[PDB]
Every structure is written in structure tokens, then in C-alpha cells.
Amino acid sequence: NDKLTLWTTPAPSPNCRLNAEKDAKLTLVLTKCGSQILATVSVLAVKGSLAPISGTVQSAHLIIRFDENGVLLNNSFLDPEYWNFRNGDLTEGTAYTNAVGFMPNLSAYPKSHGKTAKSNIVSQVYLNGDKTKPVTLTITLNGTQETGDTTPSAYSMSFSWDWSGHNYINEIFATSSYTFSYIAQE
Amino acid sequence: NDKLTLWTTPAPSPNCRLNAEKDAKLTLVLTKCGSQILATVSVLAVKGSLAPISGTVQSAHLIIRFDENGVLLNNSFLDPEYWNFRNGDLTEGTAYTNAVGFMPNLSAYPKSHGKTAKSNIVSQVYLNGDKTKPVTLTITLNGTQETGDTTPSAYSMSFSWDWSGHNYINEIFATSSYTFSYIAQE
Amino acid sequence: NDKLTLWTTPAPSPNCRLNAEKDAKLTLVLTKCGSQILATVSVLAVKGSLAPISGTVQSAHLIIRFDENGVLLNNSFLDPEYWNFRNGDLTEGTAYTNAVGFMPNLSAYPKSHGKTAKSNIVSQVYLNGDKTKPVTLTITLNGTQETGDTTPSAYSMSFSWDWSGHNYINEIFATSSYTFSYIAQE
């Protein structure tokens, strides 16, 4: 919907940093179905060590941090330009000021409790949609674990892709789409 | 819902062609949750080479094609009789004329881009719901790839089940239920 | 939502019996999206043979039974105290009398047909959210299979976790969160 969908738009421009600024295209759509958020995620590297995959990396990580109002923190690895409520296949003209209804519930997934089993959704996605090339995806809710002397978030969602033990050298890091849901804050 | 649910009904009669006309029962329910469609799919072969599985087949495929209005194309492998909006545990008496809101988004999954990682959802389902008998399911959105000199679709959803490397000879091809979501066209 | 969400609350107290009374915390949220119910489930053992896992058990099972009105049967392995419609991060003050809209559809998943492939959703969850410790989860809808001379249910949902072949002795039985959907009765 419009106010019920917070997304990166369906076909985003490079909008996130896996290793270098805007080195990847993250497609993330959060659809509010009341108490739970229905999400679909996919990622594609466009430059750097993941395009194509080199021998120095066997995982990629992205941490999205939000303030108490569900707004992206200033030093976000996800570019804020096209992260907004939906309007057709694009986004609202003006930046949202509140998206708490899309945030991961703090009672279900307490802050810093990323080690807690429940705060993690773990599954396999596939490189280039190829069934013979599995990649483990671990989604952690409100795990954050602030990077020492930095600015703390109220909420966070982290994506961790791991292909340890596989030789995908020279393949472009691109994953199949994956669906998951989580309990909303309100 | 009624207009928010497009389905095969919950307990369909043979309604699709995996190899021969009406040789399988496809249960597919598309529930519209605004920007995303929540879906559940299951299939069961009722006759032919998949009931029971013989030695000449190690995969099964079904391609559903729709026109610009989200209506099934005339030569559909899915029988149109019970493919309609919901009414209780059955379908509306009259054939729908528009279901674009249930179609896979053309910006997220551009036509012919079935090779694109993002247009694919890949996971494992289980034969007869048995954890020891995995079957890989690859769902491709708007991949279509028109069969040469034929009639082109505006949208498509294809299901590909593969059990290469497994000996399921003499087992009936029937899968466990699987949930997935995708970005809607509107 | 409120009346569209039937849950255990997001951070429940010990509320279910895997082996002994209240030996586990089951977090189960059922969100109604019309024709389908979107669900997220997670479990954590707090005492007994699963906290930590001993050598006499390689699986855990929980069967939730409901009457014709979608109300928990009296001898429920799930404690009824905090199983109700949502109100913030808690539950309605008074016990619900009808939740048929959250029950698994009897046409899609006929009673006693738990052996039927379609009535089963099978996937892998991970112990302590650790990708190296898979646990198979089999969810069976309306399988029930009444325990001989007892009281029969109109609907049921059973969860079966199995780690046969793995040595998780001394690990606490706690799983990552998992999302699934099923066709609602109405």
C-alpha cells in the first residue's frame, strides 16, 4: 500500500554499502499486515570485491539502524534517498518522520539480544537463483551491538550472507528473493 | 478475502497439466496484502508419469501465463474453471476481467529476466511431507521465455520442481505446502 | 492488529508443555490477512530434558487442539492464560469465544489427513540461531490423530522439531524464528 508499505522502491539504483559506498542494490519491501511485517529481500553487488566475488571475502553484511521514530540514522549503510513509503513504483516526495509500526518489536526482540535464538531468522538463499549455489542468510532483529564509541540505535535489522566453504570466486554476488515476517513494535 | 483472494479453491479437482491434461491438482492461493502478494502452493499428481514417479522424469514444471489484465491466456496449463476470486470455499460465479493487483511487478521482475537472481525464489519442499525426501522448488516471476512462435504473455509465474540425484521411483509426486510472497504490479 | 491477531503475546512466560508442565516458552503469532493466516513461531525450553538437551531425546512435539469455535481444548499443552487477541504487547482482558477465522481450513487440510502432503509445512530452523545447527520443523494442520480414548478436536496445529542424527547434547533447545502461512477456515 502507500502508508502500509515502506520500501527501497521495486527496482532501486545502487543504494547500500556492503564494502564500499553504493556498491550494491538492496531491494527490501516491508508491508504492514497489522501485528506482523511481511518482507521480501534481495541483494545484488554492482562493484568491488563482490562483483565479481574475489578470494578475500566469504560473507557480506548490512546493518540498518533506526532511531526511536523508525527513521534511518545519519551514518546509514542504506541510502535514505529512496527509502520511504510507497507511491506507485516510487516513493513519497517527502521524507517520513515516523515508521514505528514497521520496527521490530522490542519485547519480542529486545535490544542487544541478537544472540537470542528468537531474534534470528536463518535460511538459505541461492546465488543467481541457482539451486546448486546456496548462501546462508541470517537476519538479526534489534541485535545492533553498537560499534564502540558511536551513535546508538533504537532499532536495527541486520542481514548477514555467508558462503563459507564454497568457491564462488568470479561469480557476481546476487541472491534469489526471500520472504520473512517479524512482530511489529506497534 | 473475496476480491483480495484469487485462488484455485482450497480443495481443487484435477486442474493443471504437468505432462498430460489435468494430470495434477495444483492448490495455489494468492492473498493481496497491498504491495505484496502472500501465496501458498502445493501440488499432487493424479495420473501419468508422476503418479507414481517413473524413471524417465526427475523434474516437473508448470508455467502460468497471464495477459495485460491478469487474465489466464487461452492455452493455459492451469484450467480456468476454478481459477477466480474467492467466495467461501469456492469461486465467484463469473470469470474475473481484471487481476492486475495480483500480478508480479514488472519493475521488480522485468519480463524475460527470469535469469535475474531477484526474479527467482528457491527453496526445498518435501515429497509427501517427509523430511527425508527433499525436492527443490524454483519459482520464477515474469520469466516466461515465450515458446518460439506462440502467443506472448504480459505476466507469468513458473514453478519448477527438481529432484535430480534422488530415486523417488514409485512414490506419488505430492509436495508439502510452501509460503512465499512477491511484489505486486499495483 | 487487535481482533486480527491471536497470539501468545510477544514475550511470554513459560506457557507450554513439551515434556513437563510449563517447561517451554512458545512464541506464536497468528495474523489474519483474509484468506490466509500469516504466522511466526519460535520456541525455547526452560527446564527438563531439553534445557539442556540430554541423550534421551532427539525431537520435541507440541499439539495445539481447538474446538469447533476455535477455542483451546481444556487439556491443552498450551496454557490458555495468555493465548488471546492482541491488546498492545499483551492480550484482551477477557477470554475469546470465537476464533474460527484463525483456524486451518477443513477443505484444504481435512481432519485426520495429517499424512496428506499438503497438510504439512516442512523446513529447517536453527538451534540458537546458529547456521551450523539445523533442526527440522514439521508443522501439521488438522492432523490431530486423537490419542485413543480422549476428547476429539475440531481443528489442530502440531509442531514437530527433529534433530535426529545430530549431537546437540548440552545445548539449550531454542530455535530461530520461522514464518509460514496457511489457508483459513473462513
From Swiss-Prot, chains A, B, C:
The places in or outside the cell where this protein is found are:
Virion; Host nucleus
Q: Which domain of life is it from?
A: Viruses
Region described as Head: 4-186
Post-translational events: O-glycosylated; glycans contain N-acetylglucosamine and may play a role in fiber assembly and stabilization.
Induction (record text): Expressed in the late phase of the viral replicative cycle.
Q: What information about domains appears in the record's comments?
A: The tail region anchors the fiber to penton base capsomers, whereas the shaft, built from several repeated motifs, allows the knob to protrude from the virion.
Assembly with partners or alone: Homotrimer; arranged in a triple beta-spiral. Interacts with host receptor CXADR. Interacts (via N-terminal tail region) with pentons.
**Summary of the function given for this chain in its UniProt record:** Forms spikes that protrude from each vertex of the icosahedral capsid. Interacts with host coxsackievirus and adenovirus receptor CXADR located at the cell tight junctions to provide virion initial attachment to target cell. The fiber protein binds to CXADR with a higher affinity than CXADR binds to itself, thereby blocking the cell-cell adhesion function of CXADR dimers and leading to local disruption of the tight junction. Fiber protein present on neo-synthesized particles may thus disrupt the junctional integrity in order to facilitate further neighboring cells infection.
Q: Other remarks on record?
A: All late proteins expressed from the major late promoter are produced by alternative splicing and alternative polyadenylation of the same gene giving rise to non-overlapping ORFs. A leader sequence is present in the N-terminus of all these mRNAs and is recognized by the viral shutoff protein to provide expression although conventional translation via ribosome scanning from the cap has been shut off in the host cell.
Q: What is this protein called?
A: Fiber protein
Species this chain originates from? Human adenovirus C serotype 5 (HAdV-5)
Which part of the entire sequence is included in the shown chain? Answer: 396 to 581 of 581
